[PDB]
Write a protein that binds this ligand. Sequence first.
Ligand code: HEM
Ligand SMILES: CN(C)c1cccc2c(S(=O)(=O)NCCCCNC(=O)[C@]34C[C@H]5C[C@H](C[C@H](C5)C3)C4)cccc12
Length: 404
Amino acid sequence: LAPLPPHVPEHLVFDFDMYNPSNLSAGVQEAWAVLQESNVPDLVWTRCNGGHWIATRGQLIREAYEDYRHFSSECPFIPREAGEAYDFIPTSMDPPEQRQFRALANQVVGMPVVDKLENRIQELACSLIESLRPQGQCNFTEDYAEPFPIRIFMLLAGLPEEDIPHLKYLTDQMTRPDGSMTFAEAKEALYDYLIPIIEQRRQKPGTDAISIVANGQVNGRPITSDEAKRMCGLLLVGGLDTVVNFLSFSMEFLAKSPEHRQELIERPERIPAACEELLRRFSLVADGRILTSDYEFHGVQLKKGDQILLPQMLSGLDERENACPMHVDFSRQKVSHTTFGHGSHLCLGQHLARREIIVTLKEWLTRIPDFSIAPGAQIQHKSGIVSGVQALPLVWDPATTKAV
Ligand code: HEM
Ligand SMILES: CN(C)c1cccc2c(S(=O)(=O)NCCCCNC(=O)[C@]34C[C@H]5C[C@H](C[C@H](C5)C3)C4)cccc12
């Protein structure tokens, strides 16, 4: 624990550890929910991980994300050293600078692009599932959750499939380091990989994501190689960790709820609604901002330079905006959440993600309508900037499956 700063009131202290919260064994969402019990203030200070603020209610979380003037993305991660080193684009920029870079990225992952890659998305899902179907078992996270999104990125970025193993490796070191290299090294390794492709597509442009970004213009002038690699880095990692883990949370729930499986099988038209409800219940991201100056927020004095965690995960779990928040109801009428963020940085891949989720639910239940958690298995969760599932062993009787 770090020594409490003089300007911080002792009665607002609540030492929550975002990387190792208590009661994690009861579920990661449930663990963060402790920040929402009646005896916990709307805004608290934890002495963990260097010391920082934490907004615990949807109201404050949304407000801080809207106000970039006071809450800057220049240092969006906790601990400070990590946020300071972070330089991906446009996640580490504030408007107006961010505006142009965000518009360019929107061109490679926006809705229009989704509708065009869908055949490959649906095709990829079916291929992956059919290959597992006969087995009667699988480790969902390793066998589907991971391969699905990374193959989608290779397609949109126009990269060859033989590069997946190496990219998977580099991305794994940027969140699950084995020791071979430290973030910075993996980043450079990634940049080393991207720079050549970028320079080459500058003169020989294709219709892929890299081509578009490489030939982009900002501030009336051509984007630099430095800016291009920093944007491409995000385009790669942005849709991995999030999708892999979200799909895992979703499948873990369905594996433990036969009635919900049956609901979607009998009422397929409800899958898009089911997707939104799962996004609320199993929200998983939590990054933050840094104070640009001294500022009084909701009766609390914030000091310039202070870091504040604004858990996107917590908004939809706030009992003040969603009744019985831990209950999953595909018929819930006013599903509110900030799972994809809020404000100027609202997730650009949100449309792609939903398509990935919906296609997955539809194609999996079509071929493997009945499945369960492997007997004796005890699912483990992990907590951080992007919380998730360690592994998810599933089992089923092939006799109940169907090839389509
Ligand atoms: C279940 C999946 C997803 C979730 C929960 C999610 C979540 C988020 C969140 C919360 C942010 C904003 C962070 C902040 O304000 O600092 C964001 C940003 C972003 N996401 Fe996603 N994401 C998902 C998938 C995707 C996908 C599929 C990609 C595509 C490569 C992607 C690309 C981006 C990009 C480009 C941004 C930065 C936008 C900006 O700074 O202007 N995301 N995402
Ligand atoms: C557990 N502790 C100690 C850590 C271990 C290893 C790396 C860490 C890092 S790190 O080096 O910055 N690595 C992780 C983050 C890099 C990849 N992800 C992204 O940019 C984001 C940017 C947006 C917000 C979320 C979700 C998605 C969009 C992708 C994160 C930060 C904080 C703690 C870390």
